[PDB]
Design a protein around this nucleic acid. Structure first.
Ligand SMILES: [K+]
Ligand SMILES: [K+]
Ligand SMILES: [K+]
Ligand SMILES: [K+]
Ligand SMILES: [Mg+2]
Ligand SMILES: [Mg+2]
Ligand SMILES: [Mg+2]
Ligand SMILES: [Mg+2]
Ligand SMILES: [Mg+2]
Ligand SMILES: [Mg+2]
Ligand SMILES: [Mg+2]
Ligand SMILES: [Mg+2]
Ligand SMILES: [Mg+2]
Ligand SMILES: [Mg+2]
Ligand SMILES: [Mg+2]
Ligand SMILES: [Zn+2]
Lengths: 284, 154, 110, 150
RNA sequence: CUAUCUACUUUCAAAUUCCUCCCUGUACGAAAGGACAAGAGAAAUAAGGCCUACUUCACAAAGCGCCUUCCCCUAAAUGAUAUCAUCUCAACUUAGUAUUAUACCCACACCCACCCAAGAACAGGGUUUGU
RNA sequence: CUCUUACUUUUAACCAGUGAAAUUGACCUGCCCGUGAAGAGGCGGGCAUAACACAGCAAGACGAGACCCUAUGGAGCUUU
RNA sequence: CUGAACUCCUCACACCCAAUUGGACCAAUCUAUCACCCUAUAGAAGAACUAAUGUUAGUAUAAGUAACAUGAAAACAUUCUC
RNA sequence: GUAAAUUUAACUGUUAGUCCAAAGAGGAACAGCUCUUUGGACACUAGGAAAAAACCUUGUAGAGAGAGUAAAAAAUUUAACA
């Protein structure tokens, strides 16, 4: 009748043992999904105009200055992909939408703080539970087998991405900070008044990928993204019309490092990015 | 908005806050176990831990003596810090103090805590104790651990 | 602004008796193994804590007599010795506090 | 109320009148003062009217109790257990005669709102209407837009 | 306003504008004159966010700083009443906007305790360091 | 002030103790248009609508909140 | 065809106009005489209250709201901060 | 055709006019405006006209789970042969 938590009744001897046991299985569960292309992968189709591939969940590490060969400075946000896997596939008919949906999971989290139903879902999939789960609308040719790991090299330098996350929560704020403000007998619905500010989902559209770090799975994206550092963000191909149909040269349906290709360099750069070890630039 | 605001607002302001903590820290050093409002004990616990670190520098150290002089209002405690408390924890790298919540005090129902310097002479506090290893759940987990040893050995 | 109308008892009961206003049942209460009294899981037992404080107060009163004045904190460790006990080799060169009582079972000599 | 009071349906006691008519009034109890202006009418009623009423209604037992009282009353009891007390205080003989005969003809059921001015246990002779009463049947009971030989 | 009542406290994100260059001395223009979109850069404003640096500051908040900002708003042809003609409150055909959008959101134990970039309370996130 | 930002204290909000007042026809207290209506929560037409705390807001309800003439009335004060 | 408190129908019939007037009745109270579980005939009068910007008392609403209060530890000795 | 009228003896209260139709006299051949006259309605009911003092129907005294009625629903789309 009373409440309980995982180690409430464990002894001093069994708390370290159980902590190890559940940590070793997680490491072995993530290492068993590192070769998706030899585990009966789903059909890999070529990219076609009008295709929509999946995105990924990344953690916001922070911001860094970046310089271009034209001598301009650019501030970028480092987005690191941590334990990102495909979790579920839904076809067009069952999804109640025009496009099929691919569910993707983010950072690995403790199994001791998750609902039983969620714990049962991950048990079947064979993956540690995730912190955030997002839905991406895909075409039928972009379907990826649930359990496939997603990496930062899924995006390439020169590409644009929309980034969605919850904004920094400012709590109950006044009109001046919330709205920047210092007679029909009623207030209209939607009137700007004091209330809870921030802590809502926002999207930053058309942020170019300056650089990719394959070793640490970090995406260097232009400008800033909503939310605090170490928050989980949803990264997706830019929906802006100018950036339509530029996925012809991007990994489709996704990037499989297991696949037969020359291993990518530690860092992938955009043509205009000044690399750290390059000579000092001159404008002549 | 108080994002990343580590310190609490107490007393009549910044200077009053330090003096309130200093008085609590002075009482802890003399008595080695005091009881006060939970938030104030929690706020003072960090200073209690760091004070022991300055005591480990030694009385000869000028900066350490200046710290003890300010934080210890009763000067007879300063010798106790360098010569009693600091040597007591010479082996430990931290965790000098233990803080436990005690029942709300009668008058204002304030959340209360007891904080002490580990290793004092006073009678031991009724510390919370984890369940016995011999319990049914722990015995099932002990058997599981033993089997994982045999499997690992093989 | 003054109230436009008197609030009816019907309306006031809905406000006063709303679940949000009702005292929540506590599920963290438990029985203390040592004394058998009730305690909350995250809080020290009130009965057991008072027992420790009572003995601690007597010891502190004994410490006061030995010091015999303010600003006389000793520069050596202190050891409490109950009737029928003698200083240990480890507990040598330390201030000795003598309690006219048998050592409590919960208080274990170290 | 109508909303503030009770109601019932038109009814009889033991289907009275179906086989034979039974007078539901069975007992009348009169309290009359020997002295008392308010009992003058009741005293006169007992002298010249009660005996003739008693003979007319042999089924009713009439108890006349002469005792000191300020308010003379007649208590009427019916076969269904109903008890109806009325006051004859300062009423003339004619008024008392009217009230007593009125009690004799009542059934003893509660004098409250009667929902319907009619009651029948057999409302229909030809079958109560239902949604299929006036609907024709179709060959093989096929439904709208249903296909035979599926 | 010591605010009882009504109303309201996220219509979440399609953006406007001015200048310079370019198109181009091109289409048109007797000629002079001189496009329009298509784009390029630079500004500002508005909306939304953010802290790498600068600045007020310093576990953080902020602007004076930085980043992002997307679809579209009535003719043509043929041809009758009236055997020419006629864009048609004639019919057929084509074009045409409104409509529809896309994006975002989406799983549910313990909810005792602690922590929190979450927060008035409540709620929410983390605890696989419940020293 | 452009153009506001940060922090401290107080207030604030939450817990505990104590515990006022103005106000209050009743209330099961919605929106749009119409109705003299920019006089409608209560009327007409239409629309909307499971129930119920807490924190805000101040558009409305609701309240805190001079001047006029009139009465076969005064009082100062001014005198022609 | 629907559609009134108009009209008819069964029954009833003095029972919807302010002030005002006229004619009856009447709560309670007291008095005379009755009565005697609460009445009668009369005589009398401080004789009837949803309509008050009225008085007094009780209790609500606003509202458990506004507001109010005790520097710290301790052995309660004392010391410390201001 | 109707049933009221005058007089006598006593006595009380109401009376600061709104709208509709009609005829005038003033304003502006404005006002839900100024004045007079004729009639109607409104402080007596109900039905109808969207809600509805003033328009229409109807008068008004009860009960009915009967019936006949009264007033009572706005229309309209705008040429030509050579
Ligand atoms: K024509
Ligand atoms: K600032
Ligand atoms: K209105
Ligand atoms: K208001
Ligand atoms: Mg926040
Ligand atoms: Mg304070
Ligand atoms: Mg801004
Ligand atoms: Mg600015
Ligand atoms: Mg200002
Ligand atoms: Mg309180
Ligand atoms: Mg009639
Ligand atoms: Mg009187
Ligand atoms: Mg209030
Ligand atoms: Mg207050
Ligand atoms: Mg104060
Ligand atoms: Zn105990």
């Amino acid at each position: 009748k009373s409440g309980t938590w995982w180690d409430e009744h464990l002894s001093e001897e069994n708390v370290p043992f159980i902590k190890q046991l559940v940590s070793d299985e997680d490491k072995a569960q993530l290492a068993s999904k590192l070769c998706p292309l030899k585990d009966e992968p789903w059909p890999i189709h070529p990219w076609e105009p009008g295709s929509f591939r999946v995105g990924l969940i990344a953690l916001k590490l922070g911001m860094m200055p970046l310089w271009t060969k034209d001598g301009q400075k650019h501030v970028v946000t480092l987005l690191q992909v941590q334990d990102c896997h495909v979790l579920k596939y839904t076809s067009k008919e069952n999804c109640n939408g025009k496009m099929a949906t691919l569910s993707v999971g983010g950072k690995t989290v403790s199994r001791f703080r998750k609902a039983t139903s969620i714990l049962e879902f991950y048990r079947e999939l064979g993956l540690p539970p995730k912190q955030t789960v997002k839905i991406f609308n895909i075409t039928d040719n972009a379907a990826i087998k649930p359990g496939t790991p997603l990496y930062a090299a899924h995006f390439r330098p020169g590409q644009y991405v929309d980034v969605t996350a919850k904004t920094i929560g400012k709590g109950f704020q006044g009109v001046m900070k919330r709205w920047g403000f210092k007679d029909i007998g009623r207030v209209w619905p939607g009137t700007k008044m004091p209330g809870k500010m921030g802590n809502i989902y926002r999207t930053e559209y058309g942020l170019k990928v300056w650089r990719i770090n394959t070793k640490h799975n970090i995406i260097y994206v232009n400008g800033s993204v909503p939310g605090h550092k170490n928050c989980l963000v949803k990264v997706k191909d830019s929906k802006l019309p100018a950036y339509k149909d530029l996925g012809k040269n991007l990994p489709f349906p996704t990037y499989f490092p297991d696949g037969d290709e020359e291993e990518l360099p530690e860092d992938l750069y955009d043509e205009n990015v000044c690399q750290p070890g390059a000579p000092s630039i001159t404008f002549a | 908005i108080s994002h990343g605001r580590v310190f609490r607002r107490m007393g009549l302001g910044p200077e009053s806050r330090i003096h309130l903590l200093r008085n609590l820290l002075t009482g802890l050093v003399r008595h080695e176990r005091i009881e006060a409002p939970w938030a104030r004990v929690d706020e003072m616990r960090g200073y209690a831990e760091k004070l022991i670190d300055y005591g480990k520098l030694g009385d000869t150290n000028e900066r350490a003596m200046r710290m003890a002089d300010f934080w210890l209002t009763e000067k007879d405690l300063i010798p106790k810090l360098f010569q009693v408390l600091a040597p007591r924890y010479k082996d430990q790298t931290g965790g000098y103090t233990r803080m436990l919540q005690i029942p709300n005090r009668s008058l204002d129902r304030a959340k209360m805590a007891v904080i002490e310097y580990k290793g004092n002479c006073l009678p031991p506090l009724p510390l919370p104790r984890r369940d016995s290893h011999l319990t049914l759940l722990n015995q099932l987990l002990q058997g599981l651990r033993q089997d994982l040893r045999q499997s690992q050995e093989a | 602004a003054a109230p436009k109308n008197r609030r009816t008892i019907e309306v006031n009961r809905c406000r006063r008796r709303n679940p949000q206003k009702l005292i929540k049942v506590k599920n963290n209460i438990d029985v203390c193994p040592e004394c058998g009294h009730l305690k909350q899981k995250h809080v020290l037992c009130a009965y057991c804590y008072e027992k420790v404080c009572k003995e601690t107060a007597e010891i502190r009163r004994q410490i006061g007599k030995q010091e015999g004045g303010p600003f006389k904190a000793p520069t050596i460790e202190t050891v409490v010795l109950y009737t029928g006990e003698t200083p240990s080799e480890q507990d040598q060169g330390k201030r000795i506090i003598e309690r006219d009582r048998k050592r409590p079972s919960w208080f274990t000599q170290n | 109320t109508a909303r503030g009071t009770p109601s019932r349906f038109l009814a009889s006691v033991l289907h009275n009148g179906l086989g034979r008519y039974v007078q539901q009034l069975q007992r009348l109890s009169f309290s009359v003062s020997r002295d008392g202006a308010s009992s003058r009418g009741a005293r006169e009623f007992v002298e010249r009217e009660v005996i003739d009423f008693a003979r007319r209604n042999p089924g009713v037992v009439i108890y006349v109790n002469s005792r000191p009282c300020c308010v003379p009353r007649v208590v009427a009891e019916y076969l269904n257990g109903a008890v109806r007390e009325e006051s004859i205080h300062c009423k003339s003989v004619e008024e008392i005669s009217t009230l007593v005969q009125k009690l004799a003809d009542q059934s003893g059921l509660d004098v409250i709102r009667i929902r319907k001015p009619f009651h029948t246990d057999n409302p229909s002779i030809q079958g109560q209407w239902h949604p299929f009463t006036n609907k024709p049947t179709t060959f093989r009971g096929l439904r709208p837009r249903e296909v035979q030989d599926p």
